[PDB]
Amino acid sequence: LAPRNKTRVVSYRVPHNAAVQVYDYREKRARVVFGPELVSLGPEEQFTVLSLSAGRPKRPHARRALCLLLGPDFFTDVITIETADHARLQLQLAYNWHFEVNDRKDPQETAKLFSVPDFVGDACKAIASRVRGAVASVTFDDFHKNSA
Amino acid sequence: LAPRNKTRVVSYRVPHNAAVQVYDYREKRARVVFGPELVSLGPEEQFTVLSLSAGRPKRPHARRALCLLLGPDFFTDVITIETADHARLQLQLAYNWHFEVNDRKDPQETAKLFSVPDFVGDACKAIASRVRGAVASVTFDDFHKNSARIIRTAVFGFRDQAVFPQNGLVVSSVDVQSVEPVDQRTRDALQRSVQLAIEITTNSQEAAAKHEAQRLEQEARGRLERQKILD
Amino acid sequence: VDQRTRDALQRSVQLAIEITTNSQEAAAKHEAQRLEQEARGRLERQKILD
Ligand SMILES: Nc1ncnc2c1ncn2[C@@H]1O[C@H](COP(=O)(O)OP(=O)(O)O)[C@@H](O)[C@H]1O
Numbered sequence: 001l002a003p004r005n006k007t008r009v010v011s012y013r014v015p016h017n018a019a020v021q022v023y024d025y026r027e028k029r030a031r032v033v034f035g036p037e038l039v040s041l042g043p044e045e046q047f048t049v050l051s052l053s054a055g056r057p058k059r060p061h062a063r064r065a066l067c068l069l070l071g072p073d074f075f076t077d078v079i080t081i082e083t084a085d086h087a088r089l090q091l092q093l094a095y096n097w098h099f100e101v102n103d104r105k106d107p108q109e110t111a112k113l114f115s116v117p118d119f120v121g122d123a124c125k126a127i128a129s130r131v132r133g134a135v136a137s138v139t140f141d142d143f144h145k146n147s148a
Numbered sequence: 149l150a151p152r153n154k155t156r157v158v159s160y161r162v163p164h165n166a167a168v169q170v171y172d173y174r175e176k177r178a179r180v181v182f183g184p185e186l187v188s189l190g191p192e193e194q195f196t197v198l199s200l201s202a203g204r205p206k207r208p209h210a211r212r213a214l215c216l217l218l219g220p221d222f223f224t225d226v227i228t229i230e231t232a233d234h235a236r237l238q239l240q241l242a243y244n245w246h247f248e249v250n251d252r253k254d255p256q257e258t259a260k261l262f263s264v265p266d267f268v269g270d271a272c273k274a275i276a277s278r279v280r281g282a283v284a285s286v287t288f289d290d291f292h293k294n295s296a297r298i299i300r301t302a303v304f305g306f307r308d309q310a311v312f313p314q315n316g317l318v319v320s321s322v323d324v325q326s327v328e329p330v331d332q333r334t335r336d337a338l339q340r341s342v343q344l345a346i347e348i349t350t351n352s353q354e355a356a357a358k359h360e361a362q363r364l365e366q367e368a369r370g371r372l373e374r375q376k377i378l379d
Numbered sequence: 380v381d382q383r384t385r386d387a388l389q390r391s392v393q394l395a396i397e398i399t400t401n402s403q404e405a406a407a408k409h410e411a412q413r414l415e416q417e418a419r420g421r422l423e424r425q426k427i428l429d
């Protein structure tokens with residue numbers, strides 16, 4: 001609403017069950033902060049911006065963030081499958097996910113949380129394919145009955 | 149927006165999981181920088197510009213960059229294949245890729261990351277051909293049914309990854325996302341196929357009900373006739 | 380190159396489809412006829428046991 005003072009050290013409150021990635025281009029030094037803390041950019045430090053998939057039928061590049069929500073949530077997708085009988089089906093699915101973080105002090109592991117650019121659409125399409133494959137080898141009646 | 153001062157040393161922040169290539173035409177010296185660092189051009193140093201393929205049905209020379217995104221991503225392509233039956237199919241595919249970089253200090257290996265000019269369209273067309281070949285030798289029904297195992301082996305020949313040794317790319321998975329007949333009259337012919345499949349299950353409950361009706365109607369008659377005689 | 384060749388190849392697939400719809404309709408009928416006889420086998424034996 002009001003132009004921020006640019007001479008003020010830039011801070012960010014990181015929400016619970018999340019993490020940000022910040023790189024220091026002067027001191028050439030990386031860090032990832034976890035959880036409910038406040039993070040302050042140095043003179044030349046920067047945030048990573050995560051561009052993520054969102055929408056009913058998930059589209060890439062619909063959401064942008066600075067923190068990675070690590071914590072247990074779900075996301076929901078609408079698929080279109082087809083049976084060995086050519087019965088065209090439309091599915092409403094939901095995926096319960098979370099990030100195992102073995103060691104939070106480990107700088108090699110902790111950077112991998114940010115490897116995959118769009119971890120939402122990655123798991124959507126990678127699962128939406130596993131589902132379209134098994135079901136073309138299954139018939140309609142069998143699927144209407146054992147879909148679960 | 150505003151004309152840059154030209155007397156200022158030219159710098160570039162290289163993003164995470166990426167690399168730039170810069171050559172020094174004065175000191176005759178090459179370097180490749182990796183990762184999240186800042187790179188500053190010298191008086192006569194230059195960047196390599198990578199012209200890359202982009203679009204739904206990938207077209208060459210649609211994107212331009214200075215950094216090579218090394219890191220694990222996917223790109224998606226729309227193919228047109230055809231079966232031993234001449235059923236024309238349109239496919240939505242996705243390719244999970246990344247660059248194995250054995251030694252980042254190795255100047256001979258690290259330059260090969262920039263050998264192949266358009267590494268996107270290279271892997272697209274080189275895979276889109278591997279798929280069009282196997283599927284003309286396969287029939288429609290067999291493909292509508294086994295499309296996932298078919299396509300996986302056509303890409304990974306005798307194998308969990310396709311390596312491209314020129315630059316070092318790999319493709320670790322192919323997700324098939326949609327398979328559609330191009331022509332509509334084929335999709336009609338497939339529509340009447342399911343209307344039958346339904347009537348085959350409605351006829352089976354109506355025949356399975358009738359056989360149970362006829363069985364009980366006889367269990368009564370068996371007793372009603374025996375009861376008259378016992379009276 | 381020629382379109383009339385692509386038409387001649389188009390009728391080739393319309394047949395290929397009808398060949399698979401005829402095969403499920405003949406494979407269903409053979410299962411219908413098999414069960415209809417498994418009942419008749421029992422319904423006729425049941426009348427005699429009564
Ligand atoms: N800042 C963030 N960091 C990481 N993940 C996020 C962030 N914001 C949203 N997400 C996740 O991305 C997904 C976006 O999908 P969304 O459209 O919210 O799904 P839904 O239709 O179930 O609401 C959500 O599941 C959400 O948990």
Ligand SMILES: Nc1ncnc2c1ncn2[C@@H]1O[C@H](COP(=O)(O)OP(=O)(O)O)[C@@H](O)[C@H]1O
Nearest residue numbers: 201202203213214215216217221222223224268
């Ligand atoms: N600067 C870059 N360096 C290397 N690869 C890039 C760069 N920018 C984009 N790419 C890759 O090139 C591909 C371009 O295809 P794109 O049209 O983005 O595919 P999609 O339709 O899946 O978005 C993308 O997969 C992207 O990962």
